[PDB]
Amino acid sequence: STGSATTTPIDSLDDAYITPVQIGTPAQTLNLDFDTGSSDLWVFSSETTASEVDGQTIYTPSKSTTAKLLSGATWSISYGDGSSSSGDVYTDTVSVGGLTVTGQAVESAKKVSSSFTEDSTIDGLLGLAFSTLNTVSPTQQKTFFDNAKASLDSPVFTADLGYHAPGTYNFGFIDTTAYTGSITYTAVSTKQGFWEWTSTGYAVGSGTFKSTSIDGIADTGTTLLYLPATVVSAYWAQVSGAKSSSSVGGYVFPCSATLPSFTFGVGSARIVIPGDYIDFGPISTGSSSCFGGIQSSAGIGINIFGDVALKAAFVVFNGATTPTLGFASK
């Protein structure tokens, strides 16, 4: 089997991407944030504290003939940005782009933090990291990909995120028309439960490539590119007027600037992030200070190849017995 779904930016900055997901019988379609940095599929629901729902579409398990309470199971998660959610668990039929899993754990939110409430466009998350990170207790649950894997034509999914445009998540096959050149594959460590890999270096604009190992995770659920302070300093030093602002919480730059590209290494291959991808607009409405899309990972504890990086590539998440990551230009 295979699946193919379009993923759409939630706003004009590509702050996140939503993908339609069918849950239950008859189908209830919710727009979920596919997140390769976590491993819980959770949704706004009929159980969510009413004051914490503001415009989201909810899952109502009592209206699904295939929903079953997973007795005794609870979940609770906290994300790197400080947001959180928790609740109880159902199993139900879940389909993504024509690909169907029966008995998928659907984690029903009783509580969500303000960040989620305030984002009307995201109805929940669909985790695509390794199932070892899944927070369901006392019986840990498998991700949608893990459940689908054995049925897939090939044990892979791919992320093809658009810049200011829709893209695609495919399950079970590699669309050879979706990228240019060849796909370069690189080793993955699953030790922390992430799609963790090591980039071979970077360049700033038309500058020389610096060979240096950068360990980080491929994370579709994080907006920006978070890299070591040395790397980030080298980038923003090429932008006149750019500075790190503690009050804003990162690098800002004059909105009148033209940003240089940023290149990262995948083995001997190179992925180029155009400068425009690194512009996240005014820090506040009407400001001439703009927020940068490359930020320091210092104090996160991990480097994160988020959407800024991933959307410059066609990315293969290979879930073979020994997982790997593939990157191609597009």
Side-chain angles (χ1 to χ4, degrees), residues 54-62 64-67 69-109 112-141 143-148 150-190 192-242 244-277:
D54 187 5
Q56 295 83 8
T57 293
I58 62 168
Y59 169 59
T60 306
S62 67
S64 175
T65 56
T66 42
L69 178 72
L70 187 61
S71 181
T74 59
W75 64 278
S76 182
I77 189 159
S78 303
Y79 296 103
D81 69 350
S83 68
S84 64
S85 52
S86 61
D88 52 20
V89 188
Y90 293 81
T91 57
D92 210 340
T93 303
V94 173
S95 299
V96 175
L99 170 68
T100 300
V101 168
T102 56
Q104 175 65 43
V106 176
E107 300 173 35
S108 168
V112 304
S113 62
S114 54
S115 183
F116 287 112
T117 300
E118 294 165 356
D119 187 359
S120 68
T121 71
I122 291 176
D123 301 323
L125 267 65
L126 188 149
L128 294 167
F130 292 89
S131 292
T132 54
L133 297 179
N134 175 267
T135 76
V136 177
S137 177
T139 308
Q140 188 171 61
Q141 299 296 302
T143 68
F144 173 83
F145 178 52
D146 231 338
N147 281 322
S151 309
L152 296 177
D153 290 358
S154 179
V156 307
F157 69 90
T158 67
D160 182 9
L161 305 179
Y163 167 68
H164 293 351
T168 308
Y169 282 102
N170 290 329
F171 293 84
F173 74 103
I174 290 156
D175 179 357
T176 57
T177 74
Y179 58 88
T180 62
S182 51
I183 305 176
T184 295
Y185 288 88
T186 196
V188 166
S189 170
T190 62
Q192 291 193 91
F194 301 117
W195 292 91
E196 188 168 3
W197 64 291
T198 304
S199 169
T200 49
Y202 70 99
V204 178
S206 58
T208 62
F209 186 87
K210 175 72 170 184
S211 298
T212 187
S213 296
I214 303 168
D215 292 346
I217 66 169
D219 185 0
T220 56
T222 290
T223 314
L224 305 187
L225 175 53
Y226 294 86
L227 295 169
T230 48
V231 179
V232 176
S233 185
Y235 178 81
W236 287 109
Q238 295 306 308
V239 180
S240 186
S244 184
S245 171
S246 50
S247 60
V248 177
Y251 281 89
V252 295
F253 68 94
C255 292
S256 60
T258 296
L259 298 177
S261 62
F262 183 91
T263 301
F264 64 93
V266 183
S268 55
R270 306 287 180 255
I271 301 292
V272 180
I273 306 169
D276 289 349
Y277 291 27

